[PDB]
Amino acid sequence: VGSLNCIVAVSQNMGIGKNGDLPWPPLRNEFRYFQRMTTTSSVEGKQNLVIMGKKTWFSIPEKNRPLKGRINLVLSRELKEPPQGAHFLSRSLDDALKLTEQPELANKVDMVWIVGGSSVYKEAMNHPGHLKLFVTRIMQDFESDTFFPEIDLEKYKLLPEYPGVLSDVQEEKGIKYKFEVYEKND
Ligand SMILES: Nc1nc(=O)c2nc(CNc3ccc(C(=O)N[C@@H](CCC(=O)O)C(=O)O)cc3)cnc2[nH]1
């Protein structure tokens, strides 16, 4: 298994969801970015592993629930078995990461992308080692009920550029957004 990454789309107030959905209107090209990022793979395996919380899983339309082309792993303590459409289940992140190097996944997996739950984000960011945060900055206030943990700029450095990532401001449906990538080694 390669790299450990987190991806998120945050609004001005640092909101990531509103009643189990996006605080803002659907932004196509942004969804496109989410998709390509988490899907494209290479060295160390062949396919990416997407780790998400229970609520995150259910937050995705049933239509494309099992994110096509990625190994889907749900994190929960309540669940006894992975929800319909899901591939693997884990009790926690440290449990989920350990899984990634045992026979079952070790060869198969490249990158691991954390995509959901404020609690998952929070813990991942705390995870010791090399990590990158792929953040989409939605440049407006949106009514939220769930938020993204504060990023400690004392350890996370915002990179000047990243290959494949547009560094200028985007706009869709009258909403302007920016792509940012932060890296850390702890
Ligand atoms: N940058 C970013 N943007 C998001 O919208 C995002 N959303 C979440 C959590 N919620 C969801 C909800 C639905 C889908 C989804 O239905 N994804 C399709 C997108 C394809 C397209 O619409 O063009 C996918 O297959 O990945 C993904 C994430 C986590 N990180 C994100 N990170």
Side-chain angles (χ1 to χ4, degrees), residues 47-164:
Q47 246 191 197
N48 301 336
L49 162 75
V50 178
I51 292 181
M52 65 198 112
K54 205 172 100 316
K55 280 225 181 280
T56 298
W57 168 262
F58 288 104
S59 95
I60 306 151
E62 268 173 278
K63 165 196 227 213
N64 53 246
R65 201 163 275 164
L67 302 186
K68 90 248 272 307
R70 303 147 269 190
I71 305 152
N72 291 247
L73 184 161
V74 177
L75 296 174
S76 186
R77 249 142 273 169
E78 264 192 22
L79 252 16
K80 129 152 71 164
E81 199 210 334
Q84 142 167 109
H87 308 307
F88 299 86
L89 175 81
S90 285
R91 282 223 183 145
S92 64
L93 195 89
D94 299 348
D95 280 34
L97 302 174
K98 277 173 182 20
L99 181 243
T100 308
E101 79 223 359
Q102 280 192 183
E104 346 164 12
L105 289 168
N107 349 250
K108 231 75 136 238
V109 179
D110 184 8
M111 292 183 210
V112 15
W113 291 90
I114 291 142
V115 315
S118 314
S119 16
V120 190
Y121 285 131
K122 186 81 252 273
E123 72 188 77
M125 294 191 313
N126 259 229
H127 173 104
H130 196 201
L131 199 144
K132 287 203 272 50
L133 261 44
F134 291 69
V135 180
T136 302
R137 303 287 210 194
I138 311 258
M139 294 172 292
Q140 349 214 110
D141 254 62
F142 287 105
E143 183 171 51
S144 303
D145 72 21
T146 176
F147 308 85
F148 186 81
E150 55 161 72
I151 129 150
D152 177 12
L153 251 34
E154 216 75 270
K155 44 215 31 197
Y156 290 86
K157 134 205 16 95
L158 154 67
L159 358 164
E161 318 214 303
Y162 208 82

Side-chain angles (χ1 to χ4, degrees), residues 7 15 20 33 53 69 103 121 139 164-165:
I7 182 140
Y33 170 95
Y121 285 131
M139 294 172 292
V165 171

